[PDB]
């Protein structure tokens, strides 16, 4: 099926499961709570969608019109977060479905945002830098006129087809025309480079999130006793399909904390090496010339890598990579969805039948929105994280060590020297920066979300069907937020 119906059926399943317990769990009158279930049907449709049409001067004096869209799914939390895509395949249905997904995406990881998505029907390869500049300026102005750009209203973010370069234009075109009198004008858009108020560690956000999500589930005895793992350090092998940003970052971190990468695939032919693949060497080889073809110490594996023997699978590629035909022929034990819906619902029942754990995509790749939330907070605070506290903490730690040293010397007469910290602690002290705080916050958020998802799945007597657990958790949170006001 398509994407719209696929994401629409999940909400129906979640609401049908929730309603039975939610009728009595929230009751505080004539047993009319069943008629109160219109709240659920309020959540389904998108509140607002807008379509644009604006002219451009062009570099040759010609005139053209460009169509753009923006949708806002939920308004239960005032600031809305979404991406901007530059492609000719954009449509109103796609953007509204993506906004609907983004609302639950933010709700799962306790990010107080709404949900939005934008798309401009344009091919970036057909225009030079000046045309893209004009497109971005005019689009931002048109969005600002109707009220879809405000820092307290709607906050865009980069998509796969756009970079920080466009967001730099958006920020200063909003901060000098409409939001000139706004003190928080620069907080309208997240994802901008450092010099205009970006955040550190934004590049490796999604890989860190994927790795933390995998780790939080690979260290649970109850869940991995169902299949049998002895997990965490058993040198479990994994294969990565798709060598984009998220795949590369997650693979490096997994290798760094004790994992073996056996095979790496892409749109073109793949490779295979049972001895393991060094992430740095492979990254340098790819950066050197195009794809990873002809990598030394890598046999050119033939056949479906999705069916290759492994323990962890990372399908970070286009949609519906795993289907009904492919489902029974795979040998992996854990599926970690790194992209937007790698698997089809028809193949999900197949995995559930043979007790194959599938970590939902709604939870795994929330690092991108978590760091965006952190960047928005930084822009609101007008100060980088940890600037006013690093020296204070260093002095406090040194005082603690000196105090324990003196107190220990007092009893034992010779002079002991416990004041010296370890090499790792010394390196951490010397090179403290914002990236450490960002990574700490991301890890904490992922761990808490994983614990909440596990407890919800346990409470509603679900097995390894974590997708439904995550959707139920998000729907319950949204209902709880939206009920206590109206």
């Amino acid at each position: 099926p398509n994407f719209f119906k696929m994401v629409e059926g999940f909400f129906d399943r979640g609401a049908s499961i929730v309603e039975d317990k939610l009728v009595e769990d929230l009751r505080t009158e004539e047993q009319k709570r069943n008629r109160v279930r219109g709240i659920l049907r309020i959540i389904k449709p998108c509140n607002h969608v807008l379509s644009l049409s604006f002219p451009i001067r062009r570099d040759d004096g010609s005139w053209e019109v460009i169509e753009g869209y923006r949708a806002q799914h939920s308004q239960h939390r005032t600031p809305c977060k979404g991406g901007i895509r530059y492609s000719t395949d954009v449509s109103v249905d796609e953007v509204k479905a993506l906004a609907s997904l983004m609302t639950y995406k933010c709700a799962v990881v306790d990010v107080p945002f709404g949900g939005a998505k934008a798309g401009v029907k344009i091919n970036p390869k057909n225009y030079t830098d000046n045309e893209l500049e004009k497109i971005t300026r005019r689009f931002t102005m048109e969005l600002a006129k109707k009220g879809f750009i405000g820092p307290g209203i709607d906050v865009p973010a980069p998509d796969m087809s756009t970079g920080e370069r466009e967001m730099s234009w958006i920020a200063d075109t909003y901060a000098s025309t409409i939001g000139h009198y706004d003190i928080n004008a620069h907080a309208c858009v997240t994802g901008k480079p450092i010099s205009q108020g970006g955040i550190h560690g934004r590049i490796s956000a999604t890989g860190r999130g994927v790795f933390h999500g995998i780790e939080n589930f690979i260290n649970e005895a109850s869940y991995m006793s169902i299949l049998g793992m002895t997990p965490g350090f058993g040198d479990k092998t994994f294969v990565v399909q798709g060598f984009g940003n998220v795949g590369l970052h997650s693979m490096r971190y997994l290798h760094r904390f004790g994992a073996k990468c056996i095979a790496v695939g892409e749109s073109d032919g793949s490779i295979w090496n049972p001895d393991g693949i060094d992430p740095k060497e492979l990254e340098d080889f790819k950066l050197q010339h195009g794809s990873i073809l002809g990598f030394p110490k890598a046999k050119p594996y033939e056949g479906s890598i999705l069916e290759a023997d492994c323990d962890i699978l990372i399908p970070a590629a286009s949609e519906k990579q795993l289907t009904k035909s492919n489902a029974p022929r795979v040998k992996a034990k854990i599926i970690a969805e790194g992209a937007n819906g790698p698997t089809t619902p028809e193949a999900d029942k197949i995995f559930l039948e043979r007790n194959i754990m599938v970590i939902p995509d709604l939870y795994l790749n929330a690092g991108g929105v978590t760091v965006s939330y952190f960047e928005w907070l930084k822009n609101l605070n007008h100060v980088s994280y940890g600037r006013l506290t690093f020296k204070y903490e260093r002095d406090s730690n040194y005082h603690l060590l000196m105090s324990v040293q003196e107190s220990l010397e007092r009893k034992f007469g010779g002079g002991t020297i416990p004041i010296v910290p370890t090499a790792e602690f010394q390196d951490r002290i010397s090179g403290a920066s914002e990236k450490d705080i960002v990574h700490s916050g991301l890890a904490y958020t992922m761990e808490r979300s994983a614990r909440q998802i596990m407890r919800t799945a346990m409470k509603y007597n679900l097995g390894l069907d974590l997708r439904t657990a995550a959707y139920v958790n998000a729907i319950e949170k949204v209902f709880k937020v939206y009920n206590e006001a109206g």
Binding site: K324, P328, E353
Partner: protein, 570 residues
């Protein structure tokens, strides 16, 4: 593991080498002087130049290993013909070398040469060379031109009466053609008069074993009844009287089988007509085309008033099928009102009486006073009422309950014998499997199925029914079951077969010269029927393209009757 490749131009090279050896004048190993004529030639080349010379003088006998070889009946004409054939590399007859070759071949004791001369004379037979053609036919009388000569004599019996070719023409072939009823004729009025004139002289119209060699009752008696009524008394009139009662016995056609009602020919195949097709093609099958083995394709023809029955039952009881109602709810229920029975023995079809209960997709055996059905069921649901289907008599009567509760089960007479493997309580898989034979109408004891597998694809393996593996949701995935269980009482040993990719649930059973063919199937993964037909032979261990039916239907009844003239002519 050596192989041998032979070129197609090696004959020319061999001929060139033989010519070079002959023209060299050397390498002579056999010297023969006959009639005072001395020549030099190669023995191998001389043997290869002619046809009967190699088999006569190079047969490895005592005379073939002697300095002098004795030849009797060989004239100079034969040697000249052999030399001309060797030089020109041509073997044909003309207007000046026809009678001489036939005359010289009589004393040569060469049957192949005589047959070739007779065939050439037949291919160049005119009114001015009737005597030469007759002499050539009498000299050889080849077994391949005998039928053509007999047909020519019969078609021109008026001229053959005074012609000498009638005495030299074959007599057995003409008699067989006269008694034959399947011969191609555009009419049965002038043709009958011509046959009568050819068989007997006009004076007769106006002991001998050959007279009784004609099987009048075996041939089409419908057109010859009038001639036989005016003819002398014969014991062949009982068949006509017996067949008269068969016209009003359409319902009891299988029961009215007679010793003279045997199935003509063995042209049994699969016809892409009948049944209800829901998946994977949404097209109703209506073209009743019969595949022609000579042509290799089911050419379209005028299927006027063709029997169009939907979801009809399939059974093989002495080439006669009897069924009541029809149900295909597993692959999509489709109500139908047309019922047809395949009776190739009688070469006729009729609308049988519809029974009260639509019970089908079972095993029907021609035993007792009527066909018996094992229990019964509705179209798609089990019912508390148990009755026996009697479409022939249209009598709805209560019957005793069956030993095993089976509703809409699958069963067929494999190799002319009724057999049942495992079972299924309709569309829902059960845990208890019992094998009840419809032929015996009782729960006969059999080996219990260790694995709850059913509705599998069955083919003809080791001349017995065999079910290996299966495809269902009971195994938790779309895999192949390693355990194969087959019950072969006659064979006494298990028949190993490849797993069936497509399950066969209540499908039509057809036997075509001991070659099982499967059309359609059950595909749980796709959620519909099978869009392709595949045959997986265990011995072959490979997939081969078999006869592809026009419509990918499941459980489509096969009808055998009189084919259209255009379809028969291909």
């Amino acid at each position: 593991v050596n192989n041998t490749y032979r070129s197609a131009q090696h004959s020319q090279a061999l001929l060139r080498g033989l010519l070079a050896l002959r023209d060299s004048g050397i390498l002579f190993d056999v010297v023969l002087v006959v009639e005072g004529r001395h020549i030099e030639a190669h023995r191998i080349l001389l043997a290869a130049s002619c046809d009967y010379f190699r088999g006569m003088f190079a047969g490895g006998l005592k005379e073939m290993e002697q300095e002098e070889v004795l030849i009797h009946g060989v004239s100079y004409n034969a040697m000249c013909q052999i030399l001309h054939f060797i030089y020109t590399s041509e073997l044909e007859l003309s207007l000046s070398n026809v009678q001489e070759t036939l005359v010289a071949a009589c004393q040569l004791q060469i049957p192949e040469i005589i047959h070739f001369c007779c065939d050439f004379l037949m291919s160049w037979v005119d009114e001015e060379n009737i005597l030469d053609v007759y002499r050539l036919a009498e000299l050889f009388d080849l077994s391949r031109l005998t039928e053509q000569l007999d047909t020519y004599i019969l078609k021109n019996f008026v001229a053959f009466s005074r012609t000498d070719k009638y005495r030299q023409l074959p007599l057995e072939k003409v008699y067989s053609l006269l008694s034959s009823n399947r011969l191609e004729v555009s009419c049965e009025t002038e043709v009958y008069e011509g046959a009568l004139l050819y068989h007997y002289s006009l004076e007769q119209v106006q002991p001998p074993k050959l007279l009784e060699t004609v099987r009048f009752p075996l041939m089409e008696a419908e057109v010859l009844q009038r001639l036989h009524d005016k003819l002398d008394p014969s014991p062949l009139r009982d068949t006509v009287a017996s067949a008269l009662m068969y016209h009003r016995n359409e319902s009891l056609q299988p029961s009215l089988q007679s010793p003279q009602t045997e199935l003509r020919s063995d042209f049994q195949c699969v016809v892409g007509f009948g049944g209800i097709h829901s998946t994977p093609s949404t097209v109703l099958s209506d073209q009743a085309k019969y595949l022609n083995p000579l042509l290799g394709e089911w050419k379209h023809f005028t299927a006027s008033l063709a029997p169009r029955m939907s979801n009809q039952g399939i059974a093989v009881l002495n080439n006669f099928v009897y069924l009541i109602g029809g149900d295909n709810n597993v692959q999509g229920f489709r109500a139908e009102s047309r019922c047809w029975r395949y009776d190739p023995r009688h070469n006729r079809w009729f609308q049988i009486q519809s029974l009260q209960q639509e019970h089908a997709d079972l095993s029907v055996c021609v035993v007792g006073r009527y066909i018996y059905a094992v229990a019964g069921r509705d179209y798609h649901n089990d019912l508390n009422a148990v009755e026996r289907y009697d479409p022939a008599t249209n009598s709805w009567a209560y019957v005793a309950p069956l030993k095993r509760e089976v509703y809409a089960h699958a069963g067929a007479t494999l190799e002319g014998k009724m057999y049942i493997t495992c079972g299924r309580r309709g569309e829902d898989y059960l845990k208890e499997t019992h094998c009840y034979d419809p032929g015996s109408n009782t729960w006969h004891t059999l080996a219990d199925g260790p694995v709850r597998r059913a509705w599998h694809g069955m083919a003809t393996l080791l001349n017995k029914l065999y079910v290996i593996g299966g495809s269902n949701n009971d195994a938790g995935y779309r895999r192949d079951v390693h355990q194969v269980a087959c019950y072969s009482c006659t064979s006494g040993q298990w028949s190993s077969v490849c797993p069936l990719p497509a399950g066969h649930g209540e499908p039509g059973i057809a036997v075509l010269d001991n070659r099982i063919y499967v059309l359609g199937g059950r595909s749980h993964n796709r959620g519909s029927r099978t869009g392709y037909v595949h045959i997986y032979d265990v011995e072959k261990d490979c997939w081969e393209e078999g006869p592809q039916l026009d419509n990918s239907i499941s459980g489509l009844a096969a009808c055998v009757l009189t084919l259209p003239r255009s379809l028969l002519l291909e």
